[PDB]
Write a protein that binds this ligand. Sequence first.
Ligand SMILES: *c1ccc([N+](=O)[O-])cc1C(=O)Nc1ccc2oc(-c3ccc(CC)cc3)nc2c1
Ligand SMILES: [Ca+2]
Lengths: 21, 276
Amino acid sequence: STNMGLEAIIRKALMGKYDQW
Amino acid sequence: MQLNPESADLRALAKHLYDSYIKSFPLTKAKARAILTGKTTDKSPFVIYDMNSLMMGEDKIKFKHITPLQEQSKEVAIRIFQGCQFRSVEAVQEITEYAKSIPGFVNLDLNDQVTLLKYGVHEIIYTMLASLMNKDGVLISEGQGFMTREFLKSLRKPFGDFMEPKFEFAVKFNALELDDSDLAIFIAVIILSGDRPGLLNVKPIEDIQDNLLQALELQLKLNHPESSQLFAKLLQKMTDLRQIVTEHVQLLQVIKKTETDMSLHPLLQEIYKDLY
Ligand SMILES: *c1ccc([N+](=O)[O-])cc1C(=O)Nc1ccc2oc(-c3ccc(CC)cc3)nc2c1
Ligand SMILES: [Ca+2]
């Protein structure tokens, strides 16, 4: 994913726990 | 316009958004403007207005007689964009937190929540960036610095052209005198955009946005007696925010095909990392 960095930050913030997503 | 159950519901939603906006965004517009207008007597940014002031402080005197490195425009621009993306992590996290407080947002397909935010944050970052700008310059280094508009504009192409259209936008956006309570709903409307590429379920996004638009309409009528078409002007600012994002994406296509050699002082590279 060309945007995997940005997507990961958003995903971790949505799901709650930084270290699990 | 009447005070009725529909209006009271739209006011309850505006208050809900304002309260979660305050919880989400520690640097509010009010706090930004207080720094720009002198008020925060203990928050006195250093002004960078020329090459001399760029290199004032023991920390920086050592770049005064460093010999300028020749690099491709391409490599210098991409290193700046890597840095400002990395430094946007807090803004992106705060916007994500805010989005989860918008009623209905966490009920959307989780992949659609990621799509709405991965396109929406860039327009909201430029909204926040306006808060940090006046006609003279922009706050940098977490509010400890102030980079002048004309110094940025003086730098060699293409860098000298990067920020001037964001200033042009900011002074006109800021002239509308929105407050944090207006911005809470403005930003919610941007996030719940049914036209983002790759959305699975467009209708439930549009249903929330329709309700947010009605809440924005009422907010602007109650908060801005002086401007009877403020709602239409703000919808046109949303278009302007999308155009600035499109200009970044297009410029990146253009710079990637250039093979121009040039220097940019490391301290100017550092300051551009604080921008967008
Ligand atoms: C960073 C520092 C300085 C400047 N500058 O112009 O001086 C620019 C940046 C920067 O990287 N800005 C920026 C602007 C707009 C952007 O839009 C995206 C983007 C849009 C859409 C997607 C798909 C989900 C991903 C990224 N990145 C941007 C970066
Ligand atoms: Ca992992």
